[PDB]
Nucleic acid binder design. Structure first.
Ligand SMILES: Nc1nc2c(ncn2[C@H]2C[C@H](O)[C@@H](COP(=O)(O)O)O2)c(=O)[nH]1
Ligand SMILES: *P(=O)(O)OC[C@@H]1O[C@H](n2cc(F)c(N)nc2=O)CS1
Ligand SMILES: [Mg+2]
Ligand SMILES: [Mg+2]
Lengths: 548, 391
DNA sequence: GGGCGGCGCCCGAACAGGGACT
DNA sequence: GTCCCTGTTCGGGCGCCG
């Protein structure tokens, strides 16, 4: 039937009209499925025949479902959607099985033809007109209208509110029309409460077809198989193609990111880098060696059998993080040592230049908010970073940074700062005054240094910038200095980059600089204002300025 | 009887997504909202209201207080005792509860929409809107102003020395009285209202130069850089003579003895750094910028300015702690202190330039908020140079 | 085949802001 | 101001759910 829930008033956007789009041709099977659906819906009052009084019309089609002969009826409401008012979506996220608590008794139900059981605002029905190659309009929520998801989710919440207020201690996970129902009742009393819920829903116009009423484990729910004390993800099938396109890669990486929620160790950096500056989905990208290797390792990982567990709120949440190369991290969230609640990967590249401690901090942050969503609390961390590493970094880093309650874990690769700037200048070590200059018009530059021991060098550069020349001067000093060196720059740009202690850059030049910095025993970097006549800096400025 | 309010012309209402709340906060919000809706202060709504404003809760006591981040709505909503900054003690009362008695313009209610989220997205968000003046909204003290004046008339007559100022949810009560009978008067005002700060102890953090009996090429280079920058704020600063000591290409660690001229230059600059900044006038039509620098070891410096180098105030927050310190907690404490000071001095809150990653901040700052207002902020990834200049 | 909403991911195209330069 | 560089947002594609 049709739900006696009050309708939700919806308007068009300020000063607009309904759709006036002509139908397209449909197949014989599509037309037969549509006509059967439409006469059946017209009997039930979900669609009302219309005549000349309706100007509007918009196209209509159907698609085969995951069930065999059932066709899903769809409307191309793109024009109406454009003209329809804005909604606040109420579906704030996706429930996750690691967030479920153990229940004595579990049921999974689906509401049949759910959208088509919720009445549409009477004023708005006319903009929903469509023809079949017979003219109807929608009296219930149509599929393809942008307002249907949120209106249904809200209406479903309203419909469940009295059952939830009457059964506060029965947990009903309500994704769109799919219900998971958990209770601490013995199976018989639970089944009675489920009959109560189905009668309640039907009272509110929602039928729960018995074909989609799962009574025994495993439960199929939200892409998962829920067992009594463990859950798994329904199988994943990565393509086994030979010629990979941008679309093939997007599919591969999407399935891999989905797998990473329970499969530990998934890496997609190299497959993702493979997409930079693409033209179109149809373009064939050749698999680089590193992406080939990474995909092989992922395949191996996926061949293993794996499961998550359910959340026990009387215990601690623990998250352990491991580093893979190239700014990639995986994590396992568990409560008992070898029983993952779930897993994950953090691999986002923030910033031109960064290091492993920043990356670890932002992995900790991502995991923290993800845990707050799924479990409502922060986890305790196990990290491969010595407390002294962290202490050093938090001491000397100019930004406010913090990692919640954590404990060191001795599984390499440990996270470390790869070099350390001197807080004071080095006695005896040679002192390099470095500078760069670039010609904005010609893009020719010079980088170079003088030294207190009387050395001076200028390197000319083509197609360069001021910042690049300042860096090239620092890099040139690192090259020509010995294991200990003082360097004076007039470039707060390069100073900020190098003080930040990066171990990785997207700039080849900053990486060469980094390699140099790692090779040195002691390095002191000092800053002075440019063009103020300051002693060593003045001579370098005069040297690198000659071309400009 | 309600008062019509519009938005600023050319502006829609807030459309700000809700952030993840912890279980204890969602539980407190649900219980509080149930009571609020029983009392007709809020009503349920659905998706057809397109507006949203995030909500959370703070535990100031075993009772929670709901807090709505109306920063956006406040920006978008239609458009001061200079003696309060001098009272021997100032107390901060929460009088937001008053607002729950005045109705709210019906046509305006849709703009106060908010969403209660669900652990692990068990349910769609459950949305409400307000039927009374909301706490945390610029319009609430405005519309309640007349009733507040009538309420506070006899207390101010019977206490002409006491300064009672209102900022949005709070009464700042200021007196020169000893902190004991002061508390007596504050409880008088709280009993009357059924119908601890010390601004004379706030101080300026000036710029300071290193005191040394031996100076190196590095020491003088660092001094000249610091003084060069400082001169943008005190034009009296002079570097020509100290900079003259640096001629040539010398080793950083070499000892350089100061001439007579440079020693006098340094003494003059030392004195010039004490004088107050000339020519700095508060502009009510501009925002207050507050930059914060983390100086390490629980030390924080800050400046409150409106145009670059025109510092209305400079200060520090020094929570001396090393053993187990929370940079984010400290930083939000500093932000609340600076905001309190700005509310007291100018009645405005600053826009903060925060030296933190946006995600770290947004992950944790609600765990330490204690104030009923929330300042604007942006996130700077700002340089160690100015950091070095204010230490 | 295609329509919709949510969340995830990654990338590039707009911006904004600040330092350095003529 | 302009050029350069950095960071952020937001909209495109895919994945997953329905
Ligand atoms: N104010 C000022 N003008 C300068 C300076 N250096 C060069 N100029 C002027 C001189 C020219 O007329 C103009 C453009 O010259 P440019 O293309 O090298 O800039 C400087 O330091 N200050
Ligand atoms: P649910 O209704 O339980 O159906 C199972 C999956 O849902 C997919 N689906 C649902 C839906 F409501 C819309 N609009 N599109 C769509 O693809 C099909 S299988
Ligand atoms: Mg230079
Ligand atoms: Mg001067």
């Amino acid at each position: 039937p049709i739900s006696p829930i009050e309708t939700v008033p919806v308007k068009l956007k300020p000063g607009m009209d309904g759709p006036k789009v002509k139908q397209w041709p449909l197949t014989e099977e599509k037309i037969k499925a549509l006509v059967e659906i439409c006469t059946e819906m017209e009997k039930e009052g979900k669609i009302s025949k219309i005549g000349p009084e309706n100007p509007y019309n918009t196209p209509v089609f159907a698609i085969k479902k995951k069930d065999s002969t059932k066709w899903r009826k769809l409307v191309d409401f793109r024009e109406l959607n454009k003209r329809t008012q804005d909604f606040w979506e109420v579906q704030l996220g996706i429930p996750h099985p690691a967030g479920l608590k153990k229940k004595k008794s579990v049921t999974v139900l689906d509401v049949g033809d759910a959208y088509f059981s919720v009445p549409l605002d009477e004023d708005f029905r006319k903009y929903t007109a469509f023809t079949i190659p017979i003219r109807y309009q929608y009296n219930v929520l149509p599929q393809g209208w942008k307002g249907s998801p949120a209106i249904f989710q809200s209406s479903m919440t309203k419909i469940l509110e009295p059952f939830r207020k009457q059964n506060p201690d029965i947990v009903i996970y309500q994704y769109m029309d799919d219900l998971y129902v958990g209770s601490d009742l013995e199976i018989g009393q639970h089944r009675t409460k489920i009959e109560e819920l189905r009668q309640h829903l039907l009272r509110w116009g929602l039928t729960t077809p018995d074909k989609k009423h799962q009574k025994e484990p495993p439960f199929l729910w939200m892409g998962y198989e829920l067992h009594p004390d463990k859950w798994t993800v329904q199988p994943i099938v990565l393509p086994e193609k030979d010629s990979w396109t941008v679309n093939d890669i997007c599919k591969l990486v999407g399935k891999l990111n989905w797998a990473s929620q329970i499969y530990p160790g998934i890496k997609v950096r190299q497959l993702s880098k493979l997409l930079r500056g693409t033209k179109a989905l149809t373009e064939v990208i050749p698999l680089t060696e590193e992406a080939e290797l990474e995909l092989a390792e992922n395949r191996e990982i996926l061949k293993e059998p794996v499961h998550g567990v359910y959340y026990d709120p009387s215990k601690d949440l623990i998250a352990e993080i491991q580093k893979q190369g190239q700014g990639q991290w995986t994590y396992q969230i568990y409560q008992e040592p070898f029983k993952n609640l779930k897993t994950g990967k953090y691999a986002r590249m923030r910033g031109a230049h960064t290091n492993d401690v920043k990356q670890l901090t932002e992995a900790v942050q991502k995991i923290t908010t993800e845990s707050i969503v799924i479990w409502g609390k922060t986890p305790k961390f196990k990290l491969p970073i010595q407390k002294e590493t962290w202490e050093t970094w938090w001491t000397e880093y100019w930004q406010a940074t913090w990692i919640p309650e954590w404990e060191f874990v001795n599984t390499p690769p440990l996270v470390k700062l790869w070099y350390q700037l001197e807080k004071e200048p080095i006695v005896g070590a040679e002192t390099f005054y470095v500078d760069g200059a670039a010609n904005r018009e010609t893009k020719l530059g010079k980088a170079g240094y003088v030294t207190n021991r009387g050395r001076q060098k200028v390197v000319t550069l083509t197609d360069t910038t001021n910042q690049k020349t300042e860096l090239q001067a620092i890099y040139l000093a690192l090259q020509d200095s010995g294991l200990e060196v003082n360097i004076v720059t007039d470039s707060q740009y390069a100073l900020g980059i190098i003080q930040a202690q990066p171990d990785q850059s997207e700039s080849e030049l900053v990486n060469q600089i980094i390699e140099q910095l790692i090779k040195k025993e002691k390095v002191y970097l000092a800053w002075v204002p440019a063009h103020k006549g300051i002693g060593g800096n003045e001579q370098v400025d005069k040297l690198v300025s000659a071309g400009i | 009887e309600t008062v019509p309010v519009k938005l600023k012309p050319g502006m829609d209402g807030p459309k700000v997504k809700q952030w993840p709340l912890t279980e204890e906060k969602i539980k407190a919000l649900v219980e509080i909202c149930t009571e609020m809706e029983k009392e007709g202060k809020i009503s349920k709504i659905g998706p057809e209201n397109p507006y949203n404003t995030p909500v959370f809760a703070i535990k100031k006591s075993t009772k929670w207080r709901k807090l709505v981040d109306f920063r956006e709505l406040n920006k978008r909503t239609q458009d001061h005792p200079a003696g309060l900054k001098k009272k021997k003690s100032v107390t901060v009362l929460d009088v937001g509860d008053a607002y729950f008695s005045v109705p709210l313009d019906e046509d305006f209610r849709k703009y106060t929409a908010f969403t209660i989220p669900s652990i692990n997205n068990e349910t769609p968000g459950i949305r409400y809107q307000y039927n009374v003046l909301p706490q945390g909204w610029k319009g609430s003290p405005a519309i309640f102003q007349s009733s507040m004046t009538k309420i506070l008339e006899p207390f101010r007559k019977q206490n002409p020395d006491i300064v009672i100022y209102q900022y949005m949810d709070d009464l700042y009560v200021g007196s020169d009285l000893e902190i004991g009978q002061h508390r007596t008067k504050i409880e008088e005002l709280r009993q009357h209202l059924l119908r601890e700060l010390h601004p004379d102890k706030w101080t300026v953090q000036p710029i300071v130069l290193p005191e040394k009996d031996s100076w190196t090429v590095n020491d003088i280079q660092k001094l000249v850089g610091k003084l060069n920058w400082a001169s943008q704020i005190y034009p009296g600063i002079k570097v020509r003579q100290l900079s003259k000591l640096l001629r040539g290409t010398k080793a950083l660690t070499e000892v350089i003895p100061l001439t007579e001229e440079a020693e006098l230059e340094l003494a003059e600059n030392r004195e010039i750094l004490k004088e107050p900044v000339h020519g700095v006038y508060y502009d009510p039509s501009k925002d207050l910028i507050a930059e914060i620098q983390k100086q390490g070891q629980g030390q924080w410096t800050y400046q409150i300015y409106q145009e670059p180098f025109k510092n209305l105030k400079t200060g520090k927050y020094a929570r001396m702690r090393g053993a187990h310190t929370n940079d984010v907690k400290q930083l939000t404490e500093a932000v609340q202190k600076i905001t309190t000071e700005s509310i007291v001095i100018w009645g405005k809150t600053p826009k903060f330039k925060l030296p933190i990653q946006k995600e770290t901040w947004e992950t944790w700052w609600t765990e330490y908020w204690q104030a009923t207002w929330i300042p604007e902020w942006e996130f700077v990834n700002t340089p160690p140079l100015v950091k070095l200049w204010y230490q």
